[PDB]
Tab-separated table of C-alpha atoms in Angstrom:
chain	number	residue	atom	x	y	z
A	1	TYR	CA	147.938	29.785	151.027
A	2	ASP	CA	147.557	32.477	153.709
A	3	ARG	CA	150.211	34.589	151.958
A	4	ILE	CA	147.715	35.354	149.166
A	5	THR	CA	144.383	37.125	149.625
A	6	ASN	CA	141.481	35.222	151.171
A	7	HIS	CA	137.661	35.391	150.976
A	8	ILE	CA	137.158	32.552	148.507
A	9	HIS	CA	133.732	32.775	146.851
A	10	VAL	CA	132.296	29.302	146.283
A	11	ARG	CA	130.394	28.409	143.117
A	12	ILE	CA	127.422	26.249	142.145
A	13	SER	CA	126.568	24.770	138.744
A	14	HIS	CA	123.833	22.637	137.175
A	15	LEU	CA	120.638	24.123	138.575
A	16	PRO	CA	117.345	22.206	138.228
A	17	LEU	CA	115.443	25.409	137.350
A	18	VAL	CA	115.866	27.827	134.433
A	19	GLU	CA	113.680	30.911	133.944
A	20	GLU	CA	113.431	32.992	130.778
A	21	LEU	CA	114.110	36.740	130.708
A	22	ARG	CA	110.502	37.909	130.472
A	23	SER	CA	108.637	36.038	133.223
A	24	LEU	CA	110.572	37.674	136.090
A	25	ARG	CA	108.825	40.493	137.959
A	26	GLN	CA	108.510	41.410	141.644
A	27	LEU	CA	107.725	37.852	142.793
A	28	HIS	CA	111.306	36.686	142.111
A	29	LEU	CA	112.965	39.548	144.003
A	30	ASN	CA	116.141	38.567	145.881
A	31	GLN	CA	115.994	35.013	144.515
A	32	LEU	CA	118.950	33.066	143.110
A	33	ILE	CA	117.442	32.207	139.715
A	34	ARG	CA	119.336	30.653	136.795
A	35	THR	CA	118.644	32.894	133.787
A	36	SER	CA	120.547	32.617	130.506
A	37	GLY	CA	120.645	34.986	127.519
A	38	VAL	CA	122.930	36.360	124.821
A	39	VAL	CA	125.495	39.019	125.733
A	40	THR	CA	125.122	42.299	123.848
A	41	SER	CA	128.225	44.197	124.988
A	42	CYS	CA	130.820	44.199	127.761
A	43	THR	CA	132.932	46.761	129.611
A	44	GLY	CA	136.644	46.661	130.366
A	45	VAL	CA	138.512	47.891	133.437
A	46	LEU	CA	136.694	50.731	135.216
A	47	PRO	CA	138.358	52.526	138.162
A	48	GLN	CA	135.399	52.385	140.541
A	49	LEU	CA	135.692	54.863	143.418
A	50	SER	CA	135.612	52.508	146.412
A	51	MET	CA	138.152	53.948	148.877
A	52	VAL	CA	139.662	57.450	148.837
A	53	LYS	CA	142.102	58.526	151.543
A	54	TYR	CA	141.874	61.989	153.107
A	55	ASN	CA	144.669	63.390	155.266
A	56	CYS	CA	143.323	64.684	158.586
A	57	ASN	CA	144.991	66.123	161.692
A	58	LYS	CA	142.992	66.230	164.931
A	59	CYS	CA	143.712	63.013	166.858
A	60	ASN	CA	146.555	61.435	164.830
A	61	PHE	CA	144.032	59.271	162.961
A	62	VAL	CA	143.669	59.324	159.176
A	63	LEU	CA	140.091	59.248	157.911
A	64	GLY	CA	139.129	56.017	156.179
A	65	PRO	CA	138.475	53.517	154.777
A	66	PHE	CA	135.226	54.797	153.212
A	67	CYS	CA	132.483	53.291	151.040
A	68	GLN	CA	131.636	54.904	147.692
A	69	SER	CA	131.007	51.910	145.413
A	70	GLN	CA	127.691	51.291	143.663
A	71	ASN	CA	126.913	48.404	146.037
A	72	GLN	CA	126.718	50.410	149.273
A	73	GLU	CA	127.725	53.902	150.387
A	74	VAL	CA	127.959	55.910	153.611
A	75	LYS	CA	125.710	58.966	153.671
A	76	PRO	CA	126.864	62.014	155.665
A	77	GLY	CA	125.424	62.189	159.170
A	78	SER	CA	126.562	58.829	160.612
A	79	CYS	CA	130.286	58.291	160.079
A	80	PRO	CA	131.597	54.777	160.848
A	81	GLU	CA	134.466	56.242	162.919
A	82	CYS	CA	132.130	56.904	165.860
A	83	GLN	CA	130.640	59.850	163.923
A	84	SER	CA	133.733	62.010	163.498
A	85	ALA	CA	134.764	64.549	160.870
A	86	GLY	CA	137.662	66.916	160.311
A	87	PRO	CA	139.747	68.678	157.670
A	88	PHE	CA	140.260	67.043	154.283
A	89	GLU	CA	143.185	67.007	151.858
A	90	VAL	CA	143.250	65.768	148.265
A	91	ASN	CA	145.940	63.180	147.501
A	92	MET	CA	147.391	61.743	144.295
A	93	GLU	CA	148.598	58.184	145.010
A	94	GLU	CA	146.524	56.999	148.013
A	95	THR	CA	143.459	55.872	146.025
A	96	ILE	CA	142.884	52.118	145.681
A	97	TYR	CA	140.168	51.416	143.116
A	98	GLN	CA	138.071	48.258	142.836
A	99	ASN	CA	137.200	46.334	139.683
A	100	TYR	CA	133.674	46.924	138.390
A	101	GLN	CA	132.009	46.028	135.094
A	102	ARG	CA	128.474	46.031	133.695
A	103	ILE	CA	127.115	43.601	131.097
A	104	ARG	CA	124.124	43.950	128.768
A	105	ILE	CA	121.819	40.923	128.523
B	1	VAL	CA	159.598	85.883	128.182
B	2	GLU	CA	161.418	86.554	124.907
B	3	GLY	CA	160.192	85.940	121.378
B	4	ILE	CA	157.874	87.547	118.820
B	5	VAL	CA	154.732	89.488	119.721
B	6	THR	CA	151.643	87.909	118.150
B	7	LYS	CA	148.369	89.149	119.687
B	8	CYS	CA	147.707	92.530	121.293
B	9	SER	CA	144.761	93.662	123.407
B	10	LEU	CA	143.282	97.154	123.869
B	11	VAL	CA	144.227	100.010	126.207
B	12	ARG	CA	142.126	100.394	129.354
B	13	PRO	CA	142.702	102.810	132.259
B	14	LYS	CA	143.814	100.685	135.210
B	15	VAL	CA	142.808	102.133	138.576
B	16	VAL	CA	145.797	102.561	140.893
B	17	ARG	CA	145.083	105.199	143.560
B	18	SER	CA	141.316	105.707	143.621
B	19	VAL	CA	140.106	108.814	145.456
B	20	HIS	CA	137.831	107.217	148.049
B	21	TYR	CA	135.149	109.730	149.058
B	22	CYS	CA	132.337	109.265	151.584
B	23	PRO	CA	129.244	111.557	151.565
B	24	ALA	CA	128.937	111.442	155.360
B	25	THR	CA	131.925	111.629	157.716
B	26	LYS	CA	134.050	113.243	154.949
B	27	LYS	CA	137.165	111.116	155.367
B	28	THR	CA	139.869	109.992	152.946
B	29	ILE	CA	140.885	106.345	152.508
B	30	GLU	CA	144.058	105.129	150.773
B	31	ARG	CA	143.270	101.516	149.868
B	32	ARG	CA	145.645	99.354	147.825
B	33	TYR	CA	144.876	96.064	146.101
B	34	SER	CA	146.259	92.801	147.512
B	35	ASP	CA	146.561	90.117	144.831
B	36	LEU	CA	150.196	90.094	143.548
B	37	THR	CA	148.972	91.788	140.350
B	38	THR	CA	149.364	95.539	140.929
B	39	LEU	CA	152.344	97.367	142.469
B	40	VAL	CA	152.279	96.925	146.256
B	41	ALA	CA	150.165	93.867	147.050
B	42	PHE	CA	150.017	90.801	149.285
B	43	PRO	CA	148.585	87.293	148.781
B	44	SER	CA	144.934	87.865	149.695
B	45	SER	CA	141.990	88.619	147.400
B	46	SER	CA	140.791	91.164	144.848
B	47	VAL	CA	137.043	90.576	144.479
B	48	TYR	CA	136.156	94.152	145.510
B	49	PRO	CA	136.095	93.753	149.314
B	50	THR	CA	133.791	95.717	151.600
B	51	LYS	CA	136.387	96.342	154.321
B	52	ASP	CA	137.072	99.899	155.461
B	53	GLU	CA	139.123	101.628	158.141
B	54	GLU	CA	135.951	103.308	159.459
B	55	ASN	CA	133.252	101.059	157.903
B	56	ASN	CA	132.087	103.841	155.578
B	57	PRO	CA	130.897	103.590	151.955
B	58	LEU	CA	133.517	104.708	149.437
B	59	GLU	CA	133.103	105.934	145.861
B	60	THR	CA	135.782	106.497	143.233
B	61	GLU	CA	136.146	110.227	142.515
B	62	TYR	CA	137.749	110.720	139.093
B	63	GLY	CA	138.531	114.391	139.748
B	64	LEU	CA	142.107	113.990	140.998
B	65	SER	CA	142.626	110.252	140.514
B	66	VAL	CA	145.639	108.401	139.097
B	67	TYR	CA	145.151	106.146	136.072
B	68	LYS	CA	147.399	103.664	134.274
B	69	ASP	CA	147.258	102.585	130.628
B	70	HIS	CA	146.859	98.801	130.852
B	71	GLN	CA	147.476	96.729	127.719
B	72	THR	CA	148.250	93.001	127.704
B	73	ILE	CA	150.292	91.565	124.829
B	74	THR	CA	151.356	88.003	124.060
B	75	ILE	CA	154.892	86.900	123.187
B	76	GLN	CA	155.516	83.660	121.274
B	77	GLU	CA	159.022	82.429	120.506
B	78	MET	CA	159.972	81.239	117.041
B	79	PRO	CA	159.534	77.474	116.485
B	80	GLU	CA	162.816	77.214	114.547
B	81	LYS	CA	164.653	76.021	117.685
B	82	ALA	CA	162.006	73.546	118.875
B	83	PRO	CA	163.548	70.051	119.188
B	84	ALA	CA	161.465	66.867	119.557
B	85	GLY	CA	159.929	66.938	123.031
B	86	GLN	CA	159.568	70.600	123.994
B	87	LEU	CA	156.694	73.025	123.477
B	88	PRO	CA	156.862	76.837	123.404
B	89	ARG	CA	155.137	78.951	126.036
B	90	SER	CA	152.966	82.069	125.852
B	91	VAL	CA	152.754	84.470	128.808
B	92	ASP	CA	150.946	87.805	128.720
B	93	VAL	CA	152.974	90.997	129.170
B	94	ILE	CA	151.621	94.143	130.837
B	95	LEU	CA	152.680	97.372	129.129
B	96	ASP	CA	153.382	100.742	130.774
B	97	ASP	CA	151.840	104.227	130.675
B	98	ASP	CA	154.378	106.217	128.619
B	99	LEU	CA	154.499	103.476	125.942
B	100	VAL	CA	151.210	104.063	124.128
B	101	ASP	CA	151.036	102.458	120.668
B	102	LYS	CA	154.538	101.018	121.089
B	103	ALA	CA	153.738	97.261	120.917
B	104	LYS	CA	152.260	96.361	117.522
B	105	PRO	CA	151.890	92.801	116.193
B	106	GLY	CA	154.722	91.681	113.946
B	107	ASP	CA	157.605	93.185	115.910
B	108	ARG	CA	160.125	91.786	118.381
B	109	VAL	CA	160.582	93.372	121.814
B	110	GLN	CA	162.675	92.896	124.987
B	111	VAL	CA	160.551	92.872	128.142
B	112	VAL	CA	161.684	92.238	131.725
B	113	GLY	CA	158.930	90.901	133.979
B	114	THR	CA	158.432	88.998	137.220
B	115	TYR	CA	156.424	85.772	137.273
B	116	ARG	CA	153.967	85.682	140.177
B	117	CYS	CA	150.731	83.939	141.184
B	118	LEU	CA	147.182	84.873	142.152
B	119	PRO	CA	145.732	83.567	145.432
B	120	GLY	CA	142.358	81.867	145.293
B	121	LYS	CA	139.731	81.505	148.001
B	122	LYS	CA	138.191	78.365	146.455
B	123	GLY	CA	137.905	75.915	149.343
B	124	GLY	CA	139.411	75.816	152.801
B	125	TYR	CA	143.005	74.800	152.081
B	126	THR	CA	144.684	76.264	148.998
B	127	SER	CA	146.144	73.456	146.885
B	128	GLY	CA	148.279	73.865	143.767
B	129	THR	CA	145.979	76.394	142.093
B	130	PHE	CA	148.411	78.980	140.700
B	131	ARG	CA	147.738	80.687	137.374
B	132	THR	CA	150.279	82.360	135.094
B	133	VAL	CA	150.906	86.110	135.250
B	134	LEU	CA	153.776	88.451	134.395
B	135	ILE	CA	154.316	91.976	135.736
B	136	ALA	CA	156.658	93.659	133.264
B	137	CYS	CA	158.828	96.304	134.915
B	138	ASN	CA	160.014	97.852	131.630
B	139	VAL	CA	159.068	97.209	127.995
B	140	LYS	CA	161.872	97.803	125.490
B	141	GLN	CA	161.583	98.061	121.705
B	142	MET	CA	164.436	97.031	119.402
B	143	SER	CA	162.998	97.462	115.888
B	144	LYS	CA	160.580	100.332	116.653
B	145	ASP	CA	161.757	102.781	119.338
B	146	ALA	CA	165.385	101.822	118.634
B	147	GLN	CA	167.074	102.210	115.254
B	148	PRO	CA	170.678	101.879	114.022
B	149	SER	CA	171.966	105.416	114.515
B	150	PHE	CA	174.493	106.805	112.055
B	151	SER	CA	178.038	107.916	112.853
B	152	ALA	CA	181.221	108.890	110.999
B	153	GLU	CA	180.769	106.105	108.419
B	154	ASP	CA	177.493	107.336	106.877
B	155	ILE	CA	178.894	110.782	105.989
B	156	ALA	CA	182.255	110.256	104.281
B	157	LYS	CA	181.881	106.767	102.782
B	158	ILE	CA	178.591	107.684	101.082
B	159	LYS	CA	179.982	110.779	99.349
B	160	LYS	CA	183.143	108.980	98.204
B	161	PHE	CA	181.100	106.104	96.741
B	162	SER	CA	179.336	108.422	94.263
B	163	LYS	CA	182.479	110.279	93.129
B	164	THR	CA	185.227	107.785	92.215
B	165	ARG	CA	182.827	105.346	90.559
B	166	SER	CA	183.038	102.871	87.680
B	167	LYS	CA	180.750	103.784	84.764
B	168	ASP	CA	177.669	104.052	86.988
B	169	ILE	CA	176.892	103.057	90.573
B	170	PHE	CA	173.550	101.587	89.482
B	171	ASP	CA	175.302	98.577	87.923
């Protein structure tokens, strides 16, 4: 099984609590709550910008990987590569996108 | 770029050798553009720089200057030879000075140009930003300035056709 990708996300079903979609405010923040509801619309495949390679030449080290997804980003001023920056170069086939979809409830 | 001329622009005096005059040190400056668009040029920029050999302000004196009649025309080839996967092109053609009112729409020509590019200062490293331009060295006219000249066939054969005729030459 190690030949395939890892990071298996476990699941959990049958929760003893169900809350409607009107009684949730700031008291249920960051709480795993089981909330149902009808789906209005869905979105297909969206090429989310999650990692873009940039060719650099200063210490024989290519810049990356970066973080540009909607979950978390890296603001300029504190680079993860020990706070380093150099020349950039736009590519055409070194961009690996991540799946991302939004659902209306 | 061969084909049929479609659109034609106006005639504007293009500045070539501007008489740079300075109301101070009284010095002459011979500055040439550098953008692969005029005659002698180099890949640089043409956004009216402020550089000078003596760092003096220069103004264009139109007393003894040299102009150039600039007129850009478009040439589109006929779509009668277009297969099923190719699209015609349209590149502008720069006219000359001694060819005023010699490129009217609805007439075929025969121009000889040189395809070049314009450098851009957008960003640090210049990528694949290269626009289309054509510097025509000579514009030739086939159906306007040129015409089928006569010879020894349009002098004798025309007179003999009206003499030894049959009834009337109108029929």
